[PDB]
RNA sequence: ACCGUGAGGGAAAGGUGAAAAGAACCCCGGGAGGGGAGUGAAAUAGAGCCUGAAACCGUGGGCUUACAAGCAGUCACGGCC
RNA sequence: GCGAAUGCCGGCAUGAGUAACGAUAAAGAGGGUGAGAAUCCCUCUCGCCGUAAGCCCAAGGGUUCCUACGCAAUGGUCGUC
RNA sequence: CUCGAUGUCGGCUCGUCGCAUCCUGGGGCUGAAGAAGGUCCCAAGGGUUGGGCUGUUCGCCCAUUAAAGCGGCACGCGAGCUGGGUUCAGAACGUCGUGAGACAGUUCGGUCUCUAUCCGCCACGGGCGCAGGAGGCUUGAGGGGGGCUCUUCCUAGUACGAGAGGACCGGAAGGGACGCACCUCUGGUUUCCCAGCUGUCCCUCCAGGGGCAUAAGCUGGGUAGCCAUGUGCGGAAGGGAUAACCGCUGAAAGCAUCUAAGCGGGAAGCCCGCCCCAAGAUGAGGCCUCCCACGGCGUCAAGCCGGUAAGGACCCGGGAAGACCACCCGGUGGAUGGGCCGGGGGUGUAAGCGCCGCGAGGCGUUGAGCCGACCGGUCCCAAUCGUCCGAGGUCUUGACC
């Protein structure tokens, strides 16, 4: 219940009796680059890859990190726990029976550095009745001899883009077995034309 | 709100434009000029298409790049004097090359960029 | 597309094709009445004679502008905002009524009466 | 490859031609019957007659709010391939300059005035 | 408005200006002359990587 | 000198040497100013140049330091030199 | 014979190489001069004024004005201007 | 403590803990038949709307709600706004005063400053370390985030019942507000992308343009990015121990009791499961691949030097990463930027000539012309040449070959 992905963009698709929209994933398919067996690692499971950048380009140690169960010329590699690898290669070309339910994740489009304004919700102050820190603002940070200070970990200034995350459960809508692609109808949990993965948790009894 | 950006420039837009034009022109004149890093990069993209049209050659082309340069002498001189020598290549009729030094007091890294021969 | 304090257009027995809506009547945290929503409001416009008067009803929103985005991936916006007065239950109050179709309405359904009631060109 | 490539594809399939309808017109008032229905697939060759307002463009595109006066301002926004749609016969004639979002229309129209165009 | 309290001595003073501190300018040699060439650059001679155009009068 | 409209107020700044012998001329610099030669009893007496000490700023050396809570310190002990 | 009198006089550190560089009327290129010129000299692109950033009388100011040389101090760094 | 100063109301923005818990679930009790109520006990989880009149906090009312909680921090918050407020000269009334002036009686006005040093907080890096020196892959103690709730429907209008009403039980659906992402759809922006336009000075008279009418003159539209009013999604299951409350198996109370013996039952709560940080968790690193023991000198020579591109630097070119910076991909053995090019999306039929109209223009050539980011080619141009740094590998023990 795993799949690695170089994702494209999202685009409307029609579903049955109504159109609706999904998003584009592409995965050449990984290949148990490394396994972590339990004697090795008890965080036991799989480390795979799903593509390949110019050949010369491979660091030596890499050349061999491959040597091992040998593979090809990528760089798109990463692992995951309790994830078995009943294969030497896996491409979703079934791996993910469409009209199946998935959970997914990846890089979070590098935002910027936004005042209470953007970062957190409930932005700024007002504007007219008293505008020198105008419309937008930064609330109050605590107080005198109550905690004799400014608090410790409540929302705050700048940097909130160069970050990542995952979107819970959504649609595996359809699987295009050739051009290893999946249309899902999700938030593209981060840019498009870039990276994410798919995994499917849910002892989920509605 | 912002991060992705296409093309990108300083001063102000009417200003910039003013620049692009003036420079584009002066350079046309000497085939090579010196300014600061950026100035170069850009005047490059710019004079790049202008001149592509320069070759394009004829009624319309003249009409446009002229729309910018405003002037027979230069205008035409390009159009017929150099455009030719350029008619064959696939663009990038410009070459941006970073110089030795920097302007005084400011310490600005300059370049020389010319029409490529 | 919606509204809180609103100049809601009407039609039918309303002694005023407009009322001012207080609050979207839905879940205790209203914030927007749209096509199909029922709302809480009173009369803003004057009732020639009429039966309506100058008090207040609860009723149902029809039309609205700013995106009639429907399930079928089809849509429409009416350069107009209205509702039909709703006698408790819902059951609209007047005979005729000046307006037309757009499933949305129908889909809320409860008012199928309204449904059949104002089919044609206006 | 990328984007262009593959998506180009996905849609390629689901939409094929948005339904070889091809005759678009911009002003044309025209009428269609979409499977628009519900209540025991009372999918009725439903037809609306409207003055063509606009159009979104790529796989998914939109036969825009062709605006029609029932006895009210009813403007209808439909997605192009939308299987929803069946009939798209045209009536008026795709005219007038300053194109799309030709709202002048419902803007401050006046049947005559539209008719002045 | 809000002004310090002393200056945690030279001690701090430097601490800060400290981690600040200077650095050097990067150089290699003229693929033509000899001297210090910083990546893409010419200089009062070799003025090139093929076709000077620069240095003289 | 300088503040003030004026009445009016009202600073700072002293010393090279025994005497000019106070800097030819050679050297880097656009210059200063820096290194030489001569001064000489001295020039860390060199031109605001006697004595020129405190604050403060610098170059070098010994010891010391990245799990550390202490204005201070200072009692013990140990490693260093 | 004085830490210590928001003390006096003088130096001298301190945020601190941060704040700003005095009006959003814009610059950019090309030769010239120099020891060095974003920052001086000509030339060519562009903008801002003009009913003022006009030209003139007077007031007050009084050196400067020109001409040659010249910058180390002075122009809020620049500078050979 | 405070008068060489601790800016006193209300509001705003931001809150953070308490339960005496409004709403929530868990409960025994009933003067409980159902439904619904009233009454204590258990427990903070989240939740705890909009208006009106008032400078009011409070309050009364309009409409809601599941709920529309009370209260702590100087009645939290002016080095974070507001300044209506009370608490500066005016002036005003009415009220006192023989008047001067006054009134915790009212009324109209009335100069709230702000480059953060520190500790604190939010983020971004430079260190130096977790004794070979190397590029990537992970496990997480522990820390953070999320934990809400209403309406419908079957179960059944069956259990209750006279009747009107209407269940536990358990199973669907659909909203509200909220939280995390994200453009396709919808919709806003789009400072030069296109288009119509007026006054004027200039190009060369015409037309065809040009700047200036903001730092876009004006208007009508408008990719990409970013962005909601738009799109997906979640707040779960489920497991372990508990809360009041309920028992069982049982003596001391040779009859009785859940209660020292021992076993179980039980809340949105606690612990885990969900997601996101994370060994600078001086207690890691854990696995993966990989480079091998250079040289001259006072020695536990853990010091000075070439070392391996082992690798990585620096510099160049770039990047939805981004203040710098680190992040990251390329560096011509290229596609990395720009150019061109093709193509999507735009504006909306071009400039010229042609035809009908005295003229204004129309129609044609013309869905024409000009085009920024958007999908993808192609060494046209610029990613040249180089520089530097970077292991030899402590001692003790034990275990093996």
Swiss-Prot record, chain A:
- Keyword entries, A-Z: Ribonucleoprotein, Ribosomal protein, RNA-binding, rRNA-binding
What InterPro entries does the entry give?
Answer: Ribosomal_uL3 (IPR000597), Ribosomal_uL3_bac/org-type (IPR019927), Ribosomal_uL3_CS (IPR019926), Transl_B-barrel_sf (IPR009000)
**Is Ribonucleoprotein a UniProt keyword of this protein?**
yes
What cystine pairs are annotated?
Answer: none
GO biological process terms, semicolon-separated: translation
Q: Which GO terms describe its molecular function?
A: rRNA binding; structural constituent of ribosome
Please verify whether the record's keywords include Ribonucleoprotein.
yes
Provide a GO CC annotation, any one: cytosolic large ribosomal subunit
Similarity comment: Belongs to the universal ribosomal protein uL3 family.
Q: Kindly give the NCBIfam families that the UniProt entry links to this protein.
A: L3_bact (TIGR03625)
Query: Its quaternary structure?
Result: Part of the 50S ribosomal subunit. Forms a cluster with proteins L14 and L19.
Output the PANTHER family linked to this UniProt entry.
50S RIBOSOMAL PROTEIN L3, LARGE RIBOSOMAL SUBUNIT PROTEIN UL3C
Protein purpose: One of the primary rRNA binding proteins, it binds directly near the 3'-end of the 23S rRNA, where it nucleates assembly of the 50S subunit.
Full protein name:
Large ribosomal subunit protein uL3
Native organism: Thermus thermophilus
Gene this chain is encoded by: rplC
Curated annotation (Swiss-Prot), chain B:
Keywords for this entry?
Ribonucleoprotein, Ribosomal protein
Q: What is this protein called?
A: Large ribosomal subunit protein bL17
Gene3D superfamilies listed in its UniProt record: Ribosomal protein L17 (3.90.1030.10)
One Pfam family this sequence matches: Ribosomal_L17
Upper classification of the organism:
Bacteria, Thermotogati, Deinococcota, Deinococci, Thermales
Q: Example GO molecular function term?
A: structural constituent of ribosome
Q: Which InterPro entries is this protein grouped with?
A: Ribosomal_bL17 (IPR000456), Ribosomal_bL17_sf (IPR036373)
Stated family: Belongs to the bacterial ribosomal protein bL17 family.
Keyword Cytoplasm found = no
- What interactions and quaternary structure are annotated? Part of the 50S ribosomal subunit. Contacts protein L32.
Q: Which gene encodes it?
A: rplQ
Query: Which GO BP terms apply?
Result: translation
| Record GO cellular component, one term | cytosolic large ribosomal subunit
Curated annotation (Swiss-Prot), chain C:
Reading the lineage from the top rank, the first entry is Bacteria
Which SUPFAM superfamilies does this UniProt record tie to the protein?
Answer: Ribosomal protein L14
Its BP terms in the Gene Ontology are: translation
Cite the PROSITE patterns for this sequence: RIBOSOMAL_L14
Going by the UniProt record, its keywords in alphabetical order are: Ribonucleoprotein, Ribosomal protein, RNA-binding, rRNA-binding
* InterPro entries reported in the protein's UniProt record: Ribosomal_uL14 (IPR000218), Ribosomal_uL14_bac-type (IPR005745), Ribosomal_uL14_CS (IPR019972), Ribosomal_uL14_sf (IPR036853)
Spell out the GO cellular component terms annotated for this protein, sorted alphabetically and separated by semicolons: cytosolic large ribosomal subunit
Q: Is RNA-binding included in the keywords of this UniProt record?
A: yes
The answer to whether UniProt assigns keyword RNA-binding to this entry is: yes
An MF annotation (GO) of this entry? structural constituent of ribosome
Assembly with partners or alone:
Part of the 50S ribosomal subunit. Forms a cluster with proteins L3 and L19. In the 70S ribosome, L14 and L19 interact and together make contacts with the 16S rRNA in bridges B5 and B8.
PANTHER family found in the cross-reference section? 50S/60S RIBOSOMAL PROTEIN L14/L23, LARGE RIBOSOMAL SUBUNIT PROTEIN UL14M
> Sorted alphabetically, which HAMAP family does this protein's record hold?
Ribosomal_uL14
Q: What does this protein do?
A: Binds to 23S rRNA. Forms part of two intersubunit bridges in the 70S ribosome.
* Family from the record: Belongs to the universal ribosomal protein uL14 family.
Can you say what this protein is called?
Large ribosomal subunit protein uL14
Species annotation: Thermus thermophilus
- UniProt lineage: Bacteria, Thermotogati, Deinococcota, Deinococci, Thermales
UniProtKB/Swiss-Prot annotation, chain E:
Pfam families hit by this protein: Ribosomal_L32p
Disordered: annotated segments: 1-27
Give disulfide pairs as residue numbers: none
Instruction: Specify the superkingdom.
Output: Bacteria
Q: Assembly and interactions? A: Part of the 50S ribosomal subunit.
What is the protein name given in its UniProt record?
Large ribosomal subunit protein bL32
Q: Does the keyword Ribosomal protein apply?
A: yes
Q: Where is the composition biased (Basic residues)?
A: 1-20
Q: Please give the function described in this protein's UniProt entry.
A: Found on the solvent side of the large subunit.
Q: Which organism is it from?
A: Thermus thermophilus (strain ATCC 27634 / DSM 579 / HB8)
Keyword Manganese set for record: no
Kindly state which keywords UniProt assigns to this record, in alphabetical order: Ribonucleoprotein, Ribosomal protein
Q: Which GO terms describe its biological process?
A: translation
Can you supply one Gene Ontology CC term for this chain's record?
Answer: large ribosomal subunit
* Xref: NCBIfam families: rpmF_bact
GO molecular function terms listed in the Swiss-Prot or TrEMBL record: structural constituent of ribosome
Family under the similarity heading:
Belongs to the bacterial ribosomal protein bL32 family.
């Amino acid at each position: 219940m795993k799949g690695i992905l170089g994702v494209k963009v999202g685009m409307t698709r029609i579903f049955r009796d109504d159109r609706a929209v999904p998003v584009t994933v592409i995965l050449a398919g990984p290949c148990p680059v490394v396994q972590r067996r339990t004697p090795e690692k008890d965080g036991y499971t799989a480390v795979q890859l799903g593509f390949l950048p110019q050949n010369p380009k491979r660091v030596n140690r890499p050349l061999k990190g491959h040597f091992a169960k040998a593979g090809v010329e990528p760089v798109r590699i990463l692992r995951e726990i309790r994830d078995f690898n009943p294969e030497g290669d896996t491409v979703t070309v079934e791996i993910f029976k469409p009209g199946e339910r998935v959970d997914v994740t990846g890089t979070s489009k590098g935002r910027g550095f936004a005042g209470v304004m953007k970062r957190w919700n409930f932005a700024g102050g007002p504007d007219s009745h008293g505008a020198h820190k105008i419309h937008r603002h930064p609330g109050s940070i605590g107080n005198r001899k109550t905690p004799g200070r400014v608090y410790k970990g409540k929302k705050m200034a700048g940097h909130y883009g160069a970050e990542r995350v995952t979107v819970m459960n959504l649609e595996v809508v359809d699987v295009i077995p050739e051009e290893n692609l999946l249309l899902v109808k999700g938030a593209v949990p981060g840019p498009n034309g870039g990276l994410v993965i798919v995994r499917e948790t849910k002892k989920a009894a509605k | 709100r912002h991060l992705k950006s296409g093309r990108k420039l300083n001063r102000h837009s009417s200003h910039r434009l003013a620049l692009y034009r003036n420079q584009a022109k002066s350079l046309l004149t000497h085939g090579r000029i010196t300014t600061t890093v950026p100035k170069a990069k850009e005047l490059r993209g710019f004079v790049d298409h202008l001149i592509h049209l320069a070759k394009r050659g004829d009624l319309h082309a003249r009409r446009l790049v002229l729309r910018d340069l405003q002037d027979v002498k230069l205008v035409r001189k390009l159009f017929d004097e150099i455009a030719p020598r350029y008619r064959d290549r696939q663009g990038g009729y410009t070459r941006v090359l970073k110089l030795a030094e920097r302007r005084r007091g400011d310490g600005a890294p300059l370049a020389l960029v010319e029409l490529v021969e | 597309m919606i509204q809180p304090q609103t100049y809601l257009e009407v039609a039918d027995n309303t002694g005023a094709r407009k009322i001012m809506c207080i609050r979207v009547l839905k879940g205790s945290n209203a914030k927007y009445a749209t096509v199909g929503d029922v709302i809480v409001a009173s009369v803003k416009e004057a009732i020639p004679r009429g039966a309506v008067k100058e008090g207040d009803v609860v009723k149902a929103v029809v039309v609205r502008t700013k995106k009639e985005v429907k399930r079928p991936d089809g849509s429409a916006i009416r350069f107009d905002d209205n509702a039909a007065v709703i006698i408790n239950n819902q059951l609209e109050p007047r005979g005729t009524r000046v307006f037309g179709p757009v499933a949305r309405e129908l889909r809320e359904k409860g008012f199928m009466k309204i449904v059949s009631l104002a089919p044609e060109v206006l | 490859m990328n984007r262009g490539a593959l998506i180009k594809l996905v849609e390629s399939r689901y939409v094929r031609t948005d339904l070889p309808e091809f005759r678009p017109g911009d002003t044309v008032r025209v009428s269609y019957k979409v499977k628009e229905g519900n209540r025991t697939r009372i999918q009725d060759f439903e037809g609306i007659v409207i003055r063509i307002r606009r159009n979104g463009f790529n796989t998914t595109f939109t036969v825009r709010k062709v605006s029609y006066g029932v006895g009210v301002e009813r403007i209808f926004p439909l997605h192009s391939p939308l299987i929803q749609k069946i009939d798209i016969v045209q009536r008026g004639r795709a005219r007038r300059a300053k194109l799309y979002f030709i709202r002048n229309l419902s803007d401050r129209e006046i049947r005559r005035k539209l008719r002045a165009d | 408005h809000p002004v310090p309290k002393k200056k945690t001595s030279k001690a701090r003073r430097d601490a800060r200006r400290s981690h600040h501190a200077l650095t050097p300018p990067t150089l290699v040699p003229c693929p033509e002359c000899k001297a210090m060439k910083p990546p893409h650059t010419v200089c009062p001679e070799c003025g090139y990587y093929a076709g000077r155009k620069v240095l003289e009068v």
